[PDB]
Amino acid sequence: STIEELAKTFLEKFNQEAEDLSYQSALASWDYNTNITEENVQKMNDAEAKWSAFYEEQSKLAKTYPSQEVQNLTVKRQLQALQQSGSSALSADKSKQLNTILSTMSTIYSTGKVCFLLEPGLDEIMAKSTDYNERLWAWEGWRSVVGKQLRPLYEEYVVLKNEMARANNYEDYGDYWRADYEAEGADGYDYSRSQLIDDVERTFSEIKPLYEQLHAFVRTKLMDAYPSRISPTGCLPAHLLGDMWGRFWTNLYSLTVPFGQKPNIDVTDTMVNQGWDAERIFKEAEKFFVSVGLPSMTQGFWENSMLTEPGDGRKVVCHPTAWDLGKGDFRIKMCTKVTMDNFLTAHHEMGHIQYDMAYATQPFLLRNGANEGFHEAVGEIMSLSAATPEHLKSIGLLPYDFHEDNETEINFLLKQALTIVGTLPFTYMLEKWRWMVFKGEIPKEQWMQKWWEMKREIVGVVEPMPHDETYCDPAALFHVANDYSFIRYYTRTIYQFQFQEALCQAAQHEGPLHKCDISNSTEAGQKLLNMLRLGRSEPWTLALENVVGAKNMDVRPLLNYFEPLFTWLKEQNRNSFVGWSTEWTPYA
């Protein structure tokens, strides 16, 4: 009659039924994502509907066992994971309204027009064109056709979601999104949600000295791109950042390059001449993993996976993904070619499947990552290690006599920094703004004002036109129009370099960290696997402590990775001013 025994007995039946229904749904979805017809969608819809109905009914039944009385931690975590899932229910009348609002907010984003549609043409015009007027035209037009048509919808969305958040014992919706990082366990392994808003901020205080230098180096480089249109001591204009939003600065490499007379490493021509194929890339990727102490891929992977576009007239989307269908079924789907970026993406997806295979022995409800940010941080370090000159020289794509001149490291580090460092303040600012909006710190009538004040104070980007309260700029982003979390990227960026530092120190390497390689090293593989096999059965603090040796986020490895770039940059900024002042406007 003990509650723990009843919970155990209930979960024993639940696992067995779920392991079949989920597999059927996953196979039905794979059928659609592989072959696109008019009959596969019906089967996919039926399978997904049945799975959702079963999950909701079981979640409703599983709320009679209190989570406080159960003492065993594994059973308690399984019950907590089952009860909260499917608990998003307050009333049918308001649920219908919320669903309709979400659908109509999602559909307007896709079919927007300026007549140029976003994805084919606007992205290209934002990423290639070098004219002031055209870029400002596109920026203002896109923020006028979609932004001005979403303010009331989002104003209703915030209050309707806050009601649902309050009804479910949480404080607000921000507290709901921050519940993924809650950890309960031993004395030193407890992490509270309200702590995260502090920790993130602390880490950013260490990244400001680096990013600021970069903000100067880019600015003095745009001086030549446009003669007399940007300030020599103020913030950068918004539309000249390489994208529609400024999320990534990767498109500014051509203008902002230290030495343009030395081309970077390219192996596509050698790969074509040596006579490689799509399967050879995956064979080499598997050989990379078998040499560190991780299992080789299964027989069914080769027989069932799609590794090239089929020419039999079928239609495939073939966006590179890795699937874990359950019951020992692991597949990778990708349109493969004979370039280098596909070679790196192969390692990324291979790392995903290795992580999936690590915790296949855990119970059903605990077969996920420790937190939302580990699962891609595991896959990025593999590409970082497999894109190095030493690995390519070993594998034969480069001659042995080839050397690495200092300019090559400087250029490669600048290219990496324009992608990794530049995207952190944007994410931090957007997440902070939505958290404050949800909580209620910012009244309903001062949204855009505070948004641009934060943009001028944190990121350092100024608007070209005056925006009143009618407009709504944050809603233009895809991750906001369709509701999604955004702090995952900020966590992943720190985790991927902390893991890399730990593994490289364990792999007995000397010198700068960006020339590391974990090939032919079983100790690093064992250290990584000790965490990969843990799964979600333990709090993420212990999982992090099993690789690095700490309990929280540390930013020192990220700053160590960019030390040569920092030292070089400090030399070229002596005859310039570092920083910005928020009193200058392009329109006045």
Partner: protein, 194 residues
């Protein structure tokens, strides 16, 4: 010559809980066709050497046949515990016999999914060695007695295996035959040639 082909290559097998039991006596058995079959996965023999199984001989040989999953094969061994090793089929510690298992994915898998193989996952007490149970009474978990219908804290005691062709290795069907030897006071009747 008693027909080992009657059980080894039979068209249909039995479930774990209703496992098939066969008695073999008054014949000659040539084990050289089995150990050197070169088409088996596991051939673990306990209490008797595999090569010395052609000289010393017993009176009665009992063959137990069923089908199980892939990762549950390790549970058919002396002293092991689990879910099918304590509720469905149990082996005593002092076991003198052999366990043979092999893959059968080509036969016991369907594109839609086989579902006619059953096993037990709820019981009041562990099975005594060499015992079977085929009762279909509703398992009683909570204090409230449930009669004829299963509801809260009451469940049916049998479930089915979801065998499908595109599974892994530890989820594919495996056919298992266990041979047990008896050496009672009765005179010997069965063993190999001269």
């Amino acid at each position: 010559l008693c027909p080992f082909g009657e059980v080894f290559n039979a068209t249909r097998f039995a479930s774990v809980y209703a496992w098939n039991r066969k008695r073999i006596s008054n014949c000659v058995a040539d084990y050289s066709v089995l150990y050197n079959s070169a088409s088996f996965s596991t051939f673990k023999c306990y209490g008797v050497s595999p090569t010395k199984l052609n000289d010393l001989c017993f009176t009665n040989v009992y063959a137990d046949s069923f089908v199980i999953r892939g990762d549950e094969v390790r549970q058919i061994a002396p002293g092991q515990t689990g879910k099918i090793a304590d509720y469905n089929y149990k082996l005593p510690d002092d076991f003198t016999g052999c366990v043979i298992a092999w893959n059968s994915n080509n036969l016991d898998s369907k594109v839609g999914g086989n579902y006619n193989y059953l096993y037990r996952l709820f019981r009041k007490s562990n099975l005594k060695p060499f015992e079977r149970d085929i009762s279909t009474e509703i398992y009683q978990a909570g204090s409230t007695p449930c009669n004829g219908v299963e509801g809260f804290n009451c469940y049916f005691p049998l479930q089915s295996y979801g065998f499908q062709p595109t599974n892994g290795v530890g989820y594919q069907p495996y056919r298992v035959v266990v041979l047990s030897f008896e050496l009672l006071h009765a005179p010997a009747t069965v063993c190999g040639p001269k």
